[PDB]
Each structure stands twice: as structure tokens, then as C-alpha cells.
Amino acid sequence: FRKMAFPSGKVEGCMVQVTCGTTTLNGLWLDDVVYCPRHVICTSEDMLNPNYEDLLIRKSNHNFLVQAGNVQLRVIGHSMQNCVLKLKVDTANPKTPKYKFVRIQPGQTFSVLACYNGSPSGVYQCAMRPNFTIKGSFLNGSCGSVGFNIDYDCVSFCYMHHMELPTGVHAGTDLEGNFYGPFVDRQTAQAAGTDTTITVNVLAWLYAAVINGDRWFLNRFTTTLNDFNLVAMKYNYEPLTQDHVDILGPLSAQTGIAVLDMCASLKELLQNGMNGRTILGSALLEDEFTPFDVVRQC
Amino acid sequence: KMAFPSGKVEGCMVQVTCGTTTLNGLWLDDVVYCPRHVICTSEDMLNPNYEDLLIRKSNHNFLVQAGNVQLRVIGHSMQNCVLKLKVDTANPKTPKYKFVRIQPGQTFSVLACYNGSPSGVYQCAMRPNFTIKGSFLNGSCGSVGFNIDYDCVSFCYMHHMELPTGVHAGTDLEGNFYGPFVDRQTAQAAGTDTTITVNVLAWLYAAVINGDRWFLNRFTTTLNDFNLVAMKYNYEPLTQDHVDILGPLSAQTGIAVLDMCASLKELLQNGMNGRTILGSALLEDEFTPFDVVRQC
Ligand SMILES: *[C@@H](O)[C@H](C[C@@H]1CCNC1=O)NC(=O)[C@H](CC(C)C)NC(=O)O[C@@H](C)C1CCC(F)(F)CC1
Ligand SMILES: *[C@H](O)[C@H](C[C@@H]1CCNC1=O)NC(=O)[C@H](CC(C)C)NC(=O)O[C@@H](C)C1CCC(F)(F)CC1
Secondary structure (H helix, E strand, C coil): CCCCCCCCEEEHHHHEEEECEEEEEEEECCCEEEEEHHHHHHCCHCCCCCCCHHHHHHCCCCCEEECCCCCECEEEEEEECCCCCEEEEECCCCCCCCEECCCCCCCCCCEEHHHHHHHEEEEEECCCCCCCCCCCCCCCCCCEEEEEEEEEHHHHEEEEEEEEEECCCCCECCCCECCCCCCCCCCCCCCCCCEEEEHHHHHHHHHHHHHCCCCCCCCCCCCHHHHHHHHHCCCCCCCCHHHHHHHHHHHHHHCCCCCCHHHCCCCCCCEEEEECCCCCCCCCCCCCCCCHHHHHHH | CCEECCCHHCCCCCEEEECCEEEEEECCCCCCEEEEECCCHHHHHCCCCCHHHHHHCCCCCCEEECCCECCCCCCHHHHHHCCEEEEEECCCCCCEEEEECCCCEEEEEEEEEEEEEEEEEEEECCCCEEEEEEECCCCCCCCCCCCCCEEEEEEEEEEEEEEECEEEECCCCCEECCCCCCCCCCCCCCCCCCCCCHHHCCCCCCCHHHHCCCCCCCCCCCCCHHHHHHHHECCCCHHHHHHHHHHHHHHHCCHHHHHHHHHHHHHHCCCCCCCEECEEECCCCCHHHHCCCCCC
């Protein structure tokens, strides 16, 4: 099983660059609005504890340089929505896909189109960790790169990149500018919560193993959801929610293995280890493939 | 693993159908390239005489669709294992491109497609035994692999088949297979695979750059003595060019190439002791030195 990203072309057609002074980052051009991180309006003196409201008061439309390639897009209005800036421009992007803005849950995966100066460099698949960080490849200049899923014709944008944490992991917002996790856009050291293993994705991985004929870990027992959750937390696994149980429905139907029976199987793997065996050619339980990713790929 | 952005290639994918057989084609200027086994029926795929099968076909037996629009085929020819269909319409989305044949150990991105529609993108390496560990299903043939430099798309791979072991085989865009494989519906084994040593070293450098360095040591080795151990463990030999290619990473970390070779030697001889590197229980060999630099 490979980490497979969504084709990036519909998002490539929306990437622009946004500059204030010498500060350049990426923005997302949909219809006649460009969305980008608000810290583009920051100097250095500001990034320590920016007063974003006062910094924006000193800005006019004519202070923002928005470019698609080297072609300038005239800004005709501006506003700030949480931690994102919205720049109204005088041209509707002809490459605008059908799209939605969504807020994802920890454990969900998405593709990131890593961009620099409005130019895409690469695409890769990310998982939102339970502590609301991602393990991106994000260098200087990458802010405003976005994360997305594609369903049928429709791009669901779920992430915009803002910052790196002391541990090297990455943090950002949804496209309404609300951070995932307890982070703020200030050049200060911020700690994430201790991370945990994404249980629903491990279960998805065990279902994928069964689908491929690797099923030694299946047992004849079951558990309640509450009993499983209380044990799982002692192993630094996330508790399951009702939505997790439901998104495992399709794989449970495909294999005939009830969700709670698979939970009982995972509980035994936690309490006894792998006994020197492997699953899908791996001694490690994988937690960055969602139930959707398993299906999308199998 | 990071892939190249796929948009320039998405704008070239089309669907090609002959009979009940459908797969993907690549539409550049006024030509569509696709695997020649599109002309086969089930019965044919078992032992096909392609020149015989092809002369029995007319332009109108080929149905090419770019989304909703059918493109009319006005000519066809076969080049090795690829069919070239001339169409009456030029693709305005054709990027600047070249056809290249890649070397084993090199990496490329794959745009997996079904029915002419892009499905996913991922990074692959050409294995030393000329297979690729892909994720391809029924209908993925004609999906291509590529690298992008500046604005130029270098196409290096077109997908044709799966082997019993589950790995994949295909051709360059001139239709010549990578490896000893043939486009016939028969079970085919590959040569013994080896590990791409220069890529393992590059990935160990990436691990150090990210502060994961338990595997380092103060031993050293000559290039030849390292290569003796590598061959024993079915790792590819390391050439002086490989050592030179690793220079930048050596400079960045201050770890001499041959010192990283000594570290790898001890991993081969002792294993990983149930430890991980960059989260992996196994040594990763599908990142090139260039891949590592680009991303670090
Ligand atoms: C594209 O047309 C398709 C892609 C295959 C299907 C499943 N996964 C893939 O990568 N290509 C073929 O189906 C190909 C056609 C021949 C004329 C070359 N045959 C093929 O790949 O056969 C494979 C699926 C079987 C596997 C079982 C076997 F016993 F080993 C014989 C080959
Ligand atoms: C935007 O392009 C940039 C992306 C960063 C740069 C390197 N890798 C990234 O993900 N974001 C910022 O520069 C951001 C701006 C603030 C106004 C929110 N600050 C930031 O991420 O600084 C990081 C690099 C340091 C790391 C060390 C620390 F102690 F945690 C303080 C923040």
C-alpha cells in the first residue's frame, strides 16, 4: 500500500503569490477572491506578537502585490477572517474548480501541494495527527500552500499552511482561518499535545490486511466500544468515536468482520505484541491510511 | 515521498477503446500514445501476434475520448509496444516535453489513471531488476511516469502489466520494455532484485538532517571494502560517481560519504535492533540524492 496523493492540477490552477513589502507567500485564487495567511502583512518587528488589527489598518488595497506567475492581479478589497486575509481581485479565476471549504478531524488525510513563490513544487499525502499537527515537508516560503481532498469533480480545501513548531512538525488553519489545535500565528515557540496513534486508521489497515489474505490476528472474541477505548488509551491510542465506527462500515461489510471484533483483535495485538510476526509485510501498525484511503486504493 | 505536481500531465490524458478493451492514452500535439495491447481481445492477450492483429484494424476501430469529446483517428502506427494514433485535433494543453529512458535507481512520479481520468499521483523508483512497485489496477494501462524540470515534462514510463509478485512492468515512450518482460498475458518472473545503495545512503543523510542519528558510528571503510559487503547483501555497488553525487549531502551534515557507508555496513550486518529510521523498520531505497536535496 502506497501513500497516494490526489492529482494536483485543479489546485495548481488556483495558486498565486502574495507580497507585502519583501514578505512573499502563497495564496489561493478562487473566483474573484485570493485567500492567504494574514501574517503576510508582517515585518520582523511584528512577527513576535503582531497586532494584526493595527497592522491591517495601515494597509490599503494598493499595498498588496498579487501575482499569478509574473502577471499582477489588481486588488479591489481586503478583509481579515480569523487568521486568513481575503483579497478581492478584479478578475475571476477561469480555472476555478468546483470547490468547498471543509474542516477536517484528526486522523483524516489530505494531499498537500507544496508551493514556493506561487509555483508548485510537489504533492504528497499528509495525515492530521491527533495533536493537530502534520508532518509536512514545508520550507521557508511555503506558507499559504493548501491541503485538499477531491471527490468526483469537487475540491474540498481543508488546510492552509502557517507555521513550524519547535519539534519540526507543522501547523495551520482551515480556509476560514481557524487554526487546527492550540496554535497562534506568532513567531513564538509553541508546544503540541503529546501525540497518539490514530486507532481508526490502524483498524482500517487491519481490514486492508484481511482483504489481501493476511488474517492471522483475527480472534473469536469481541469487546464493547467503551472497554476498548479504556484499554486503548493505556497504549497511547486514540479512543474511537461513533463516527469512526461508522466510517469503518464499508470495510466491515467487505470482510464480514464486525468493527468490535476487529477492535478485540487489535486489543490482543496491543496486549501481546506481534509475537515476531508481520502484517502486510510490516512489523509496525500503520496509522496514516484512512478507511477511505484503503478503499480508494484497493 | 513527494511527487511532482501532476497538472501538466492530467491535461494530456485520454481514453482509448478498441472492442471491449479500454485503457489510457497520452495526447501530445496531434498524437495519442497508448499500449498496443488495447487492440487485443481476451483470446488475443494469451499469445498475441501484434503485427497480425494490427493490420486487421482500421482507424475507425479506435475510439479516443477526451472527456466528453471524441477525437477522430486519422492515422495509426506501432512503435515497439506502443501504438501512436494520429488525431485530427491538436492538444492545446500539450506541455513542453521530452521522452527519456530512465536508469535503474532513478525515481519518477506516476499519474495513475482509469478511463482517461486521473486517480492519484505517487513516486516510484525504477528497480535494479527493472520492475516498479506501483499501485495499478485493471484499466490503469497507459498511465505514465514522468519527471518535471522547470516547465519541461520528461516522460519516462508507460504502464503495461503486473507480475505474479504484484510488482509492475512497462515501457519507455518509444515502446521498449524496461527489463526482460513481454506484453503477453503470461506469468513472468523478474530477475533477483537488489537494493539501490546510493538511495539508501541519501535517505540515511535525510535521517541525520532531521536529527535521527542513532545508527552513526566512528568506524570507516574503503569504497571497495564497502562494496564487497554490499554485494554480499544484494545491494548494488556504489560507484565514485555515486560518491560524488552524495557530496552536497555530505557537506551539509559533515558526515563523509565513506563514514555513512560504514554506518550502512553495520546496519546490514547487525540489523536495526527493532529500532526505526525516519519512522521505518526497513531501509528505504526509493529516494535519490536529488530527491533528498530538493526537500531538505
Ligand atoms: C492494463 O491493461 C493492465 C494493468 C494490470 C491489470 C491489473 N494490474 C495491472 O497492472 N494490463 C494487463 O492486464 C496485462 C495485459 C497483457 C497483454 C500484458 N496483463 C497483466 O498484467 O496480467 C496480469 C494481471 C496477470 C497476473 C496473473 C498472472 F498469472 F501472473 C499472469 C499475469
Ligand atoms: C511561512 O512560509 C512560514 C513557514 C515555516 C518556515 C519554515 N518551515 C515552516 O513551516 N511560517 C512562519 O515563518 C511563521 C510566521 C509566524 C508569524 C506565525 N513562524 C514560524 O513558523 O517560525 C518557526 C520556523 C519557528 C521555529 C522555532 C520556534 F521556537 F518554534 C519558533 C518558531
